[PDB]
Amino acid sequence: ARKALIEKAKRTPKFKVRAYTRCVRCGRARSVYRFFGLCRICLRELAHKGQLPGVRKASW
Amino acid sequence: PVNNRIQDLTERSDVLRGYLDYDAKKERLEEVNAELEQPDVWNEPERAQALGKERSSLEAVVDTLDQMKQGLEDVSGLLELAVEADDEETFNEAVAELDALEEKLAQLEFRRMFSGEYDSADCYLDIQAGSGGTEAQDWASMLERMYLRWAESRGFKTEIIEESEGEVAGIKSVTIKISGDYAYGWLRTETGVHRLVRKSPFDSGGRRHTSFSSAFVYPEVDDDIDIEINPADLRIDVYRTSGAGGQHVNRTESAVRITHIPTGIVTQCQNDRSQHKNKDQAMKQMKAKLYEVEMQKKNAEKQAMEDNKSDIGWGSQIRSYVLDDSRIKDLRTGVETRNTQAVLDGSLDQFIEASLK
């Protein structure tokens, strides 16, 4: 049960509760960041790639 | 769901026509009808028995699988004639005579269970380690607990009789009392050596490792201790004692000898001065010699089990549960279920019923 779900998460529900974030890149249901539309894994991949504007390795 | 409870009767009848040889019995039943028609068949009434009752033994097979292929086809047209007319009696009348054919079929499937004299005795299950080592003593324990969950499902008693836990970790031997109905019939087709192939948690460099264990199943017969002995086959001889004693040993038949006629065992006594204090002894010792011989028959039968089982060793599998690519091949028949950790939970129906043929 994956592609039906990476699809069904897009489609409008019967009640607004049933809507849920999937990672728009890989389809992940867990640890989906609202700000990026991405999961923690994709977020890390792109960040290292440099394809996230302003996003950087945070050191303090 | 009723049109799926007739589809399971179509599968249970084809498997019944496959092992029972629907063709080698439709053909054999025809040659019996050709010999018994002649009025000159009662020439040696012994021969007519093994054919007239054999014809009824093949008409309980051929004719039953004919009334199951035609009777279920008449139900596939009776359930769609009550739906398109809202007729609710034609639908109570196409399942009543459908559950009677499910008993004609379930009864004829007890040609798998009625193949072993007495297949309801509260049997025992003996799992032994061997091969593999510590790995197999773990494997023997997993195979132990698996059958326990099996009996938990179909409704039996799980009283462990004898154990021997492994030295490091695991079980060397177990004896379980499967007290239930058709108990021996179910577990009978488990007698063998089950093979396990996986990464051993006990190997220093975590290698792929094979370990075996056995399961031996016998039904329940009872004590069968002592057997009755009437004096109608005993032949008690009397004579005089030998050696010291004086006059009262020269004119006295104080010694006895009890020779058992059918067994051929002899036994004497001469200890005490009385013929019947000796005859007491000679009955005593005689009971002992028969208890030895009737024991030696059973121990001879015990060695028959030992010498016909064997050997929890390599070239000796009946089923191979390999957990490193998720398969359990029962190389006897042989199914190839991919649910390894579901069979270890007790789903042996997949094997038992299919391997009673």
């Binding site: 700000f35 790639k49 504007p53 | -």
Partner: protein, 206 residues
């Protein structure tokens, strides 16, 4: 095992982002997604050209995708034929002023992602993986780079036992921030399975 990505490690020190613009809390997500689709479409269609970098800029309602490639002609087309053909296919999805540029790749044999796709291509061509790797590192050093390192992981030669082969020359100081090192990755789909490629080129300590 361990080593961190050497480009993501130098962003805003020795290395510059590839999608450079601003967006707020309410917009960021949707812009980024289509932006990756831009990267998506072009990555396949422009492969044949020798696609090396995809810099992207945005101003209020319009976006300009500047494509670095070794063979610009293969991108633009005939006298400008496809560069126009692309811009329309592009801004169809985008829906905005999609100025599609091209830029020269001065010496592809000093562009790490380029070197990587070469070898990945080479081993789909059933080449001697060790020879490919030794070759690859030598041109990159010939072209003047102060150092180079290339590694390929997977069923090498088709072998059942996966292995890692690498080769290196000069310096490749991945711990030094001030060292400019281009990095690139290439996936080689074969009959027996996937091979991974890493290419490290040490351009200099800038």
């Amino acid at each position: 095992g361990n080593k961190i990505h050497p480009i993501g490690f130098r962003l805003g020190i020795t290395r510059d982002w590839e999608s450079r613009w601003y967006a707020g809390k309410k917009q960021y997500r949707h812009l980024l997604l289509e932006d990756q689709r831009i990267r998506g479409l072009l990555e396949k269609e422009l492969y044949s050209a020798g696609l090396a970098r995809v810099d992207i800029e945005r101003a209020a309602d319009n976006v300009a995708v500047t494509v670095h490639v070794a063979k610009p002609g293969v991108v633009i087309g005939r006298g400008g034929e496809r560069i126009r053909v692309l811009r329309e296919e592009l801004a169809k999805l985008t829906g905005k002023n999609v100025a599609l540029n091209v830029q020269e790749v001065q010496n592809p044999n000093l562009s790490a992602p380029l070197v990587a796709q070469r070898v990945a291509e080479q081993i789909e061509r059933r080449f001697a993986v060790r020879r490919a790797i030794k070759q690859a590192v030598q041109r990159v050093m010939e072209s003047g780079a102060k150092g180079a390192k290339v590694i390929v992981s997977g069923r090498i030669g088709g072998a059942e036992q996966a292995r890692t082969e690498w080769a290196a020359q000069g310096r490749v100081p991945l711990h030094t921030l001030r060292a400019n090192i281009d990095y690139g990755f290439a996936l080689a789909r074969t009959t027996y399975g996937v091979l991974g490629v890493k290419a490290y080129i040490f351009l200099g300590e800038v």
